[PDB]
């Protein structure tokens, strides 16, 4: 309701905003006269050092390192060493038959990435009928994945398909 | 200090219990005037002191259990003798309870042996 | 009444009434450091101004206040002052008056935090948990009857064990036949279906109802088997009575509609709601 | 049914009617009293079978010599005791579900119970059931002997925080007098 | 609303029989329960996905190590907070460590979240000192399975507290002398008490989503402290002071400065009325402590002649009349009678003898 | 000496409009001084109106706020004292004689002192 | 040395042997100390006003005195807390480090790589339980004794 002060106070929009001092700080100094507002040691230091220098944003490695020991992740020759830094080679070690590792090449951390591309698809998959059926179930389940997430969904679905291979 | 890695402290796990127990009664035990106005303020302190008290209590518990485990895996004969004595005491207590129940039943039958008045 | 404590909050209210205006002028103590995004900073000023409306709310706070005044002004407190100079060296007592309160208040927290117990063991450290005297039963009965509008009766025609019946606003009386100290093996019925005053010839059992209170009876049995604290049987029976009191209405029906089943009740969490869901 | 396994206490009524009566029976885990989380009450029936209520009015009907639900109650009581001792000494959450994941196909008349408790920088897990792996226990630290450092040695600031390897505990030949001594292995956190 | 979407018997129907033969070892009932069991723990989690399908990273269906026997739902790249994020976000990400969700309660309706962080600067001792952040627990229990709101609220809270902690990194000249005392280790709320030759003046710091401001509560820990020894009488006001700036060092300094004066002023009885009124049948107290500012207090006596003594210096204080108001003899304050006798000489008699 | 019937309720109620109008006046004079200085720095000889120096008005606003605050604190002290006296003291205000009341008060004070001494001895034995 | 300095023990002797009994007694002592803390808090909780309506100075005057005893009790417990604490650190005989970290593999099943008195006591206890259950059975069956006969019982 008492808005008469509002617009007249808002009048002082332009650059020459210094007179406010002479309007308030004396009266303020009457009631509030504190010399001790921030007497403790204080200094501004913007930055010291900032860079990953080892990989993509930490979140991906930090999450994948939390996976089971059943998976064994490593890196191929570094063709995307700095920016991409994602082409994973995994070895399923469990109570199941082993197989060929996948590709798993991802995109920036937004993760619209169906990472595996099966560089060794044709000849490694034409070997035996069993592993061919494994690949068929793999791609069939991958198609079912709505907005798959390379971080966990890929390896989990691959393990599930490998465990489905026993019919 | 907080950010420092080294922990410069010692002499705990014994005096710590008495210290914690005595200290957080300060709200009560104090030779000082008590301002007759306070509410929802003394709570957080006693919550904290029960917290730390149960914490150091759990610490002592774990220490005692670890010592017991070490001595057991070191000197199993002691634990064997302890279990033997415990079983002996349990058997003695069972026999005592049995004798008490027997005496009770004996008394009960003896008092009403002639419950019937006459014929 | 106890509405005086509300004034305490009002205290804090007027405290803001000061701070607010300070927060105003402090906001006017300096201008735009570097907006670089928008001019809402000035609006920020008005934002603080908005909090001044709170002050008006304080005036509104008095509408709910001022319920009624109590007779005998000064509440017998300064009667000691009416004494001669001999009585004035006595304020100490008044201090203790608060102190004792703090004591209770302290326990009010302490006992509360005592809820998280640490008794790793409760035996092999000693007895006769069953109450010997056949007088503590009458004590518990009187303690329960001290509660208002809830009548309790007992006859115990079976023997040493305890037998009692309780009635409420409805005819949903509850018959509890338990041991010397703690409540167990009870049953409930409704509308003279038990009639445990002179049922047939005496306070009969009859183990029956028309498939409505059976669930309530089972839940009460569960509550009895669950609230069996190791000690303090009076606390146990008081908790049981408080639990029983929660059915005096049977009106509300949250987290569902009033059509799920015959009825709805399972309040071990001090609040009843739709049954068959927990 | 249980010798080294959790025993069972018996307490019958002191006043029994003409036909009906009831019996109070609690688990009563050995050497402890703060584990009273399963005290089931049943009432006998003449023509029909006994009705029973553990905690939530779970009445079921049955026959003369078919009461194997008792074993399920024992498994649930074991889980609840793990929960209680975790509350004693670092108290993990209440994710002790009565089912989950179908570990070993859970044979034994619907027997299913599994809980877990990470105290400090460790992680414990337990599972029980009717002879379907009754004694199931797993415990594993963070900094282990064998692992996959290949993809992780590249990242600096070695992370002794996460917990990757299962490393089952094999709760056999351990000094457990009544299986309620898991607190001893729990005690192996920091001293 | 009965949907008409596909059902397909998405589970092992009907090869589930062969799942029974997949075991290592009188009734086959063992299978049936499984179904009515698995739903009881499966269907909730996917629902949570639909709620987490709106913020970021709905990575659902993960299973922690298998032997854990619990459907795992981790979090990945927690979204930024609407608060100070310009530079604090980098610290938050550099500190973001493993984190996940698990069911809780009676497994029906309760959620629990577990978090850890990187090296915590505020991490002192007496809390099982460990390099990495030990544990951060969050519990929630809704009614119609909206937990994401309270989750993000707590996240913003701990974020602001972490910003405060990171700003705390410095070296004060003489205050840290009063061994170190920061044993109230940050779990998700930072407390401090390092006064009175020991632990004392326990402060409180947290964010309640009820409003934007913080919470501050004086403590009463310390054996050699007073009956209350707290700072409640001014605490409220002091709280808005910290609302001015998150510089905890300012709170520390101002508290260390005002401790002794308010400790002295609280010694006198204020609450009791000291018997009947000195003049008539009316009601009057004997002293009225007044928190009208951050450090200036004007104690009253019999609702009149209220001198104004306060502290602003490093080791000294100042007293002045409370009826002049920057006005020698122009007007009054429309209240208590002014200038009782002579207070200036009474003060200077025992104010400073050695000072010259 | 005030003689305000010692009743704080109607006093605070009748004093609220004073706070309201004083806030109104201070905002008004602040806006006046603002338009004055904003015509001073860049305008011309236009602001010729001697208003209040804004010091006395604001300070007396603080002072009336102070008086109402102390009155409310006195009211709270009075009600709290009435409450605890009712809660832990019987009603005998001329059915017990005043000497009996004084003796009861002294006995309770002695019991509280005994409790305090017991707790102090406990704390001592602990340390 | 560590001996019976007023500890509420059942049968323990507290001698140079049986350090297991010492550790268990210390654990029981600290547990009972926490329990006594909770108990005395519960007692001081309902510290009603001394100036009772009916009772002038009769009831509470006794109760508080009793509380003092309780205090004394916990007092001596603290003393006991020291007596055991030395003994725990005194019997440092055999494998002082004793790494529990290494012990955890030892309590595992595998890694893919004297008891005469005990058995005697076990057999004795088993026979005792057998005769105990035999004595039970009779009164166990005859326990009801009125259940079938409630038709005319009172």
From Swiss-Prot, chain A:
Subcellular location: Cytoplasm; Nucleus
PTMs per UniProt: Ubiquitinated by TRIM11, leading to proteasomal degradation.
Protein function: Component of the Mediator complex, a coactivator involved in the regulated transcription of nearly all RNA polymerase II-dependent genes. Mediator functions as a bridge to convey information from gene-specific regulatory proteins to the basal RNA polymerase II transcription machinery. Mediator is recruited to promoters by direct interactions with regulatory proteins and serves as a scaffold for the assembly of a functional preinitiation complex with RNA polymerase II and the general transcription factors. Required for cholesterol-dependent gene regulation.
Family: Belongs to the Mediator complex subunit 15 family.
Record note on quaternary structure: Component of the Mediator complex, which is composed of MED1, MED4, MED6, MED7, MED8, MED9, MED10, MED11, MED12, MED13, MED13L, MED14, MED15, MED16, MED17, MED18, MED19, MED20, MED21, MED22, MED23, MED24, MED25, MED26, MED27, MED29, MED30, MED31, CCNC, CDK8 and CDC2L6/CDK11. The MED12, MED13, CCNC and CDK8 subunits form a distinct module termed the CDK8 module. Mediator containing the CDK8 module is less active than Mediator lacking this module in supporting transcriptional activation.
Identification of the protein by name: Mediator of RNA polymerase II transcription subunit 15
Gene from which the chain derives: Med15
UniProtKB/Swiss-Prot annotation, chain E:
Subunit structure of this chain's protein: Component of the Mediator complex, which is composed of MED1, MED4, MED6, MED7, MED8, MED9, MED10, MED11, MED12, MED13, MED13L, MED14, MED15, MED16, MED17, MED18, MED19, MED20, MED21, MED22, MED23, MED24, MED25, MED26, MED27, MED29, MED30, MED31, CCNC, CDK8 and CDC2L6/CDK11. The MED12, MED13, CCNC and CDK8 subunits form a distinct module termed the CDK8 module. Mediator containing the CDK8 module is less active than Mediator lacking this module in supporting transcriptional activation.
Annotated compartments: Nucleus
Signal sequence, renumbered to the chain: none
Protein name, per record: Mediator of RNA polymerase II transcription subunit 14
Family (UniProt): Belongs to the Mediator complex subunit 14 family.
Region annotation (Interaction with SREBF1) ranges: 1-207
Gene: Med14
Parent-record interval covered: 587 to 979 of 1459
Function: Component of the Mediator complex, a coactivator involved in the regulated transcription of nearly all RNA polymerase II-dependent genes. Mediator functions as a bridge to convey information from gene-specific regulatory proteins to the basal RNA polymerase II transcription machinery. Mediator is recruited to promoters by direct interactions with regulatory proteins and serves as a scaffold for the assembly of a functional preinitiation complex with RNA polymerase II and the general transcription factors.
Highest taxon of source: Eukaryota
Swiss-Prot record, chain F:
Major localization listed first in the record, in broad terms: nucleus
Tree of life domain: Eukaryota
Keyword annotations of the record: Acetylation, Activator, Nucleus, Transcription, Transcription regulation
Record-level GO BP terms: positive regulation of transcription elongation by RNA polymerase II; positive regulation of transcription initiation by RNA polymerase II; RNA polymerase II preinitiation complex assembly
Subcellular location: Nucleus
Record-level GO cellular component terms: core mediator complex; mediator complex; nucleoplasm; nucleus
UniProt subunit comment: Component of the Mediator complex, which is composed of MED1, MED4, MED6, MED7, MED8, MED9, MED10, MED11, MED12, MED13, MED13L, MED14, MED15, MED16, MED17, MED18, MED19, MED20, MED21, MED22, MED23, MED24, MED25, MED26, MED27, MED29, MED30, MED31, CCNC, CDK8 and CDC2L6/CDK11. The MED12, MED13, CCNC and CDK8 subunits form a distinct module termed the CDK8 module. Mediator containing the CDK8 module is less active than Mediator lacking this module in supporting transcriptional activation.
Family per record: Belongs to the Mediator complex subunit 29 family.
Name of this chain's protein: Mediator of RNA polymerase II transcription subunit 29
Natural source organism: Mus musculus (Mouse)
Taxon lineage: Eukaryota, Metazoa, Chordata, Craniata, Vertebrata
Residues of the full protein shown: 48 to 185 of 199
Curated annotation (Swiss-Prot), chain G:
GO cellular-component term (any): core mediator complex
A Pfam family per the record: Med30
UniProt xrefs under InterPro entries: Mediator_Med30_met
UniProt KW Acetylation keyword: yes
Coiled-coil ranges from the UniProt annotation: 114-149
The entry's keywords: Acetylation, Activator, Coiled coil, Nucleus, Transcription, Transcription regulation
One record GO biological process: protein ubiquitination
Domain of life, source organism: Eukaryota
Subcellular location: Nucleus
GO MF annotations in UniProt: nuclear thyroid hormone receptor binding; transcription coactivator activity; ubiquitin protein ligase activity
Functional summary from the UniProt entry: Component of the Mediator complex, a coactivator involved in the regulated transcription of nearly all RNA polymerase II-dependent genes. Mediator functions as a bridge to convey information from gene-specific regulatory proteins to the basal RNA polymerase II transcription machinery. Mediator is recruited to promoters by direct interactions with regulatory proteins and serves as a scaffold for the assembly of a functional preinitiation complex with RNA polymerase II and the general transcription factors.
Similarity section: Belongs to the Mediator complex subunit 30 family.
Protein name: Mediator of RNA polymerase II transcription subunit 30
The organism of origin for this protein: Mus musculus (Mouse)
Encoding gene, per UniProt annotation: Med30
């Amino acid at each position: 309701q008492p808005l008469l002060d509002a617009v007249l106070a808002n009048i002082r929009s332009p650059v020459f905003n210094h007179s406010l001092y002479r309007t308030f700080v004396p009266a303020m100094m009457a009631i509030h006269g504190p010399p001790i507002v921030s007497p403790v040691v204080c200094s501004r230091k913007r930055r010291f050092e900032e860079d990953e220098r080892q990989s993509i944003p930490n979140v991906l490695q930090g999450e994948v390192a939390r996976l089971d020991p059943k998976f064994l992740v490593n890196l191929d020759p570094s063709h995307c060493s700095n920016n991409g830094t994602v082409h994973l080679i995994c070895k399923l070690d469990d109570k199941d038959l082993p197989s060929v590792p996948p590709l798993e090449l991802s995109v920036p951390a937004d993760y619209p990435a169906q990472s595996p591309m099966w560089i060794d698809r044709q000849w490694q998959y034409d070997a035996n009928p069993f592993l061919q059926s494994v690949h068929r179930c793999m791609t069939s389940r991958l198609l079912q994945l709505p907005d798959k997430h390379s971080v966990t969904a890929l390896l989990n679905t691959w393990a599930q398909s490998i465990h489905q291979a026993c019919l | 200090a907080a950010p420092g890695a080294p922990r410069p402290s010692n002499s705990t796990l014994v005096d710590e219990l008495e210290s914690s127990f005595e200290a957080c009664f300060a709200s009560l035990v104090s030779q000082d005037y008590v301002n007759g106005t306070d509410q929802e303020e003394i709570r957080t302190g006693v919550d904290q002191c029960i917290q730390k008290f149960l914490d150091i209590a759990r610490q002592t518990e774990c220490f005692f259990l670890q010592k017991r485990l070490q001595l057991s895996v070191q000197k199993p004969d002691q634990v064997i003798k302890e279990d033997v004595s415990e079983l002996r005491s349990e058997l003695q207590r069972k026999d005592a309870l049995v004798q008490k129940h027997l005496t009770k039943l004996r008394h009960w039958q003896q008092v009403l042996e002639d419950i019937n008045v006459q014929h | 009444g106890v509405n005086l404590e509300a004034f305490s909050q009002a205290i804090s209210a007027i405290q803001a009434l000061r701070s607010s205006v300070s927060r105003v002028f402090d906001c006017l103590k300096d201008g735009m450091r570097n907006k670089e995004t928008l001019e809402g900073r000035e609006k920020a000023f008005i934002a603080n101004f908005q909090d001044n409306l709170h002050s008006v709310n304080r005036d509104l706070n008095e509408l709910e206040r001022l319920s009624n005044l109590v007779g005998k002004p000064s509440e017998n407190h300064p009667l000691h002052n009416s004494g001669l100079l001999s009585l004035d060296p006595y304020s100490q007592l008044l201090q203790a008056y608060k102190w004792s309160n703090k004591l209770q208040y302290h326990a009010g927290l302490a006992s509360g935090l005592l809820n998280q117990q640490s008794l790793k063991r409760s035996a092999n450290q000693m007895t006769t948990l069953v109450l010997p005297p056949q007088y503590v039963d009458d004590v518990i009965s009187r303690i329960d009857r001290m509660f208002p509008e809830m009548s309790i009766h007992l006859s115990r025609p079976n023997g040493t064990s305890a037998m009692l019946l309780v009635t409420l606003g409805k005819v949903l009386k509850v018959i509890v036949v338990m041991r010397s100290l703690f409540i167990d093996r009870t049953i409930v019925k409704g509308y003279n279906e038990s009639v445990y005053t002179e049922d047939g010839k005496l306070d009969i059992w009859s183990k029956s109802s028309y498939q409505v209170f059976q669930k309530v009876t089972d839940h009460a049995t569960t509550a009895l088997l669950h609230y069996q604290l190791p000690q303090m049987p009076d606390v146990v029976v008081r908790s049981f009575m408080t639990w029983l009191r929660s059915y005096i209405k049977l009106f509300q029906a949250p987290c569902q509609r009033c059509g799920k089943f015959l009825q709805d009740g399972l309040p071990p969490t001090w609040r009843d709601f739709r049954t068959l869901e927990a | 049914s249980r010798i080294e396994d959790p025993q069972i206490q018996a307490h019958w009524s002191n006043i029994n009617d003409v036909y009906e009566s009831s019996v109070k029976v609690l688990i009563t885990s050995q050497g402890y009293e703060q584990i009273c989380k399963s005290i089931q009450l049943q009432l006998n029936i003449g023509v029909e079978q006994v009705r029973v209520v553990h905690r939530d009015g779970r009445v079921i009907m049955l026959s003369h010599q078919e009461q194997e639900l008792q074993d399920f109650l024992l498994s649930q009581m074991s889980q609840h005791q793990v929960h209680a001792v975790q509350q004693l000494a670092w108290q993990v959450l209440s994710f002790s579900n009565h089912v989950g994941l179908g570990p070993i196909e859970s044979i034994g008349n619907a027997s299913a119970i599994t809980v877990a408790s990470p105290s400090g920088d460790y992680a414990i897990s337990v599972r029980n059931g009717p002879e379907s792996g009754s004694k199931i226990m797993v415990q594993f630290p963070r900094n282990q002997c064998k692992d996959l450092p290949k993809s992780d040695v590249l990242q600096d600031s070695k992370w002794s925080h996460l917990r990757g390897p299962f490393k089952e505990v094999q709760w056999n030949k351990m000094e457990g007098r009544n299986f309620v001594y898991k607190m001893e292995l729990l005690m192996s956190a920091l001293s | 609303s009965p949907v008409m979407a596909l059902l397909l018997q998405q589970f092992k129907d009907n090869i589930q029989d062969l799942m029974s033969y997949t075991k290592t070892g009188c009734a086959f009932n063992k299978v049936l329960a499984h179904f009515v069991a698995m739903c009881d723990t499966n269907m909730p989690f996917v629902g949570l996905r639909l709620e987490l399908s709106n913020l970021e990273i709905p990575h659902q269906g993960v299973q922690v190590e298998g032997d854990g026997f619990n459907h795992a739902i981790r979090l990945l790249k927690i979204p930024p907070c609407k608060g100070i994020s310009e530079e604090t976000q980098k610290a938050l990400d550099r500190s973001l460590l493993d984190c996940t969700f698990r069911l809780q309660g009676r497994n029906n309706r309760t959620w629990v979240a577990e978090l850890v962080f990187a090296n915590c600067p505020l991490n002192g001792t007496s809390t099982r000192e460990q390099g990495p952040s030990r544990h951060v627990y969050l519990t929630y229990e809704n009614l119609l399975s909206k937990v994401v709101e309270m989750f993000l609220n707590d996240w913003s809270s701990i974020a602001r507290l972490y910003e405060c902690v990171l700003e705390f990194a410095r070296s004060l000249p003489e205050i840290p002398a009063h061994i170190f005392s920061e044993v109230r280790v940050y779990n998700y709320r930072k407390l401090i008490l390092c006064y009175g030759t020991t632990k004392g003046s326990s402060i409180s710091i947290q964010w309640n989503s009820i409003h934007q401001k913080f919470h501050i509560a004086l403590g009463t820990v310390g054996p050699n402290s007073g009956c209350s020894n707290c700072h409640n009488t001014i605490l409220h006001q002091l709280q808005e002071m910290f609302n001015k700036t998150p510089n905890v060092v300012q709170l520390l300094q101002v508290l260390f400065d005002t401790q002794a004066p308010l400790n002295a002023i609280n010694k006198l009885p204020t609450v009791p009325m000291l018997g009947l009124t000195q003049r008539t049948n009316t009601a009057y107290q004997c002293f009225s402590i007044l928190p009208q500012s951050s450090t200036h207090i004007r104690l009253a006596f019999r609702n009149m002649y209220c001198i104004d003594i306060y502290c602003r210096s490093r080791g000294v204080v100042a007293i002045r009349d409370g009826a002049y108001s920057l006005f020698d003899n122009s007007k009054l304050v429309e209240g208590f009678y002014p200038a009782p006798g002579l207070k200036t000489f009474l003060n200077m008699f025992v104010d400073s003898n050695q000072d010259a | 000496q005030q003689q305000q019937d010692f009743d704080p309720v109607q006093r605070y109620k009748m004093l609220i409009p004073q706070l309201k109008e004083s806030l109104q006046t201070l905002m008004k004079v602040a806006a006046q001084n603002l338009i004055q200085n904003t015509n001073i720095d860049n305008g011309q000889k236009s602001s010729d109106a001697p208003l209040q120096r804004f010091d006395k008005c604001l300070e007396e606003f603080y002072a009336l706020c102070d008086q109402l605050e102390l009155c409310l604190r006195l009211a709270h002290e009075c009600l709290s004292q009435s409450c605890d006296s009712a809660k832990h003291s019987p009603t005998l205000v001329p059915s017990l004689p005043y000497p009996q009341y004084l003796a009861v008060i002294k006995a309770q004070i002695t019991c509280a002192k005994d409790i305090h001494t017991a707790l102090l001895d406990c704390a001592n034995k602990v340390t | 040395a560590s001996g019976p300095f007023g500890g509420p023990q059942a049968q323990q002797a507290a001698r140079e042997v049986n350090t297991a009994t010492l550790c268990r007694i210390g654990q029981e002592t600290v547990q009972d100390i926490v329990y006594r803390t909770m108990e005395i808090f519960q007692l001081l909780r309902n510290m009603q006003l001394p100036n009772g309506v009916t009772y002038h100075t009769g009831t509470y005057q006794d109760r508080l005195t009793k509380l003092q005893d309780h205090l004394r009790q916990l007092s001596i417990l603290f003393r006991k807390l020291r007596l055991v604490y030395d003994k725990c650190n005194e019997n440092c005989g055999g494998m002082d480090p004793i790494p529990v970290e290494q012990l955890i593999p030892y309590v595992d099943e595998d890694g893919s790589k004297e008891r005469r008195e005990i058995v005697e006591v076990n057999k004795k206890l088993k026979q005792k339980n057998q005769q105990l259950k035999q004595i039970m059975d009779q009164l166990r069956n005859l326990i009801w004794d009125i259940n079938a006969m409630l038709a005319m019982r009172n």
